[PDB]
Amino acid sequence: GSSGSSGTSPPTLLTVDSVTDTTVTMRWRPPDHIGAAGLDGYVLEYCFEGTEDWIVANKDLIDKTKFTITGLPTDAKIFVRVKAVNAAGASEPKYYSQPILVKESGPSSG
């Protein structure tokens, strides 16, 4: 059977940058190294609660290391997951320990 997977490393340091009742922001860092073939952008998916299928977010490829899910219902919990996609294959998906709530939040002294 087909032998040969992505020899690159998946997206690490996955954390939420900012959150807005309108949309949510997610940032991540690149892999320590890149496979010979070469890294081809990245992919980000999100599954809505109450469903059994994930909803694509990125159209083609995510150039920047940040992504924002547009069009999100206020007070809604969604699961974010990213992975590495190279011409060789793909890496395992990253599951954020805790979900990202699409709710506004500001700084609080103390």
Tokens of 17: 């940058």
Write down the H helix ranges in the chain: none
Are 77 and 99 in contact, with CB atoms under 8 Å apart? yes
CA distance 81 to 23: 16
Q: Which positions ≥6 away from 110 have C-beta within 8 Å?
A: none
**84: how many CB neighbours lie within 10 A of its CB?**
26
Residue 11: phi and psi, rounded to 5, are: -70, 120
Chain centre to alpha carbon of residue 54: 12
Q: Tell whether domain 6-103 is in CATH 3.40.50.720.
A: no
Q: Which positions ≥6 away from 23 have C-beta within 8 Å?
A: 68, 69, 70, 71, 72, 102
Strands (E), 8-53: 12-19, 24-29, 39-48
CA distance 42 to 44: 7
Structural domain boundaries in the chain: 6-103
CA distance 54 to 97: 17
CA distance 46 to 55: 5
